[PDB]
Amino acid sequence: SMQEEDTFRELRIFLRNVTHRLAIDKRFRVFTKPVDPDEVPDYVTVIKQPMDLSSVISKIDLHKYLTVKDYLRDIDLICSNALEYNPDRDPGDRLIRHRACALRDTAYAIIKEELDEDFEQLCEEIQESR
């Protein structure tokens, strides 16, 4: 129905806004674009599902997210990829992991405060009906 398509449009608006706010945060610069093959050639061999905030924006616009839970799976993937690829004790790896955790925690915190649970449940129920 048109009411359902309006629901998903509002969802995309909400997701674009959250993603923007993450993408403009200086801490999260490393997560705004794909890892560059030239600089890190073993990346695509170790990490089987690369993800980044630019790809998330593209996915929003392609209607790939019909719930906030589906969006959060890709925010979680950005974070888990960073933890997996950079697991060592040195300061460069520890910094990226701290930033990855902050990206995840920040996204969840924005969503906890600004997503209406009945809106999410509506999206879930429409998604399940398809």
Give structural notes.
The protein is mostly helical and 130 residues long. The protein has one domain (1-130): Up-down Bundle (Histone Acetyltransferase, Chain A), CATH 1.20.920. Helix content is 68%, strand content 0%. It has six helices and no strands. It has helices at 2-23, 43-46, 53-61, 68-85, 91-114, 117-128. The longest helix has 24 residues, at 91-114. The PDB classes it as signaling protein. The entry lists the keywords Structural Genomics Consortium (SGC), signaling protein. It forms a monomeric assembly.
Show the helix and strand layout.
Elements: H1 2-23, H2 43-46, H3 53-61, H4 68-85, H5 91-114, H6 117-128
Short structural summary:
The PDB classes it as signaling protein. By secondary structure, the protein is mainly alpha-helical. It has helices at residues 2-23, 43-46, 53-61, 68-85, 91-114, 117-128.
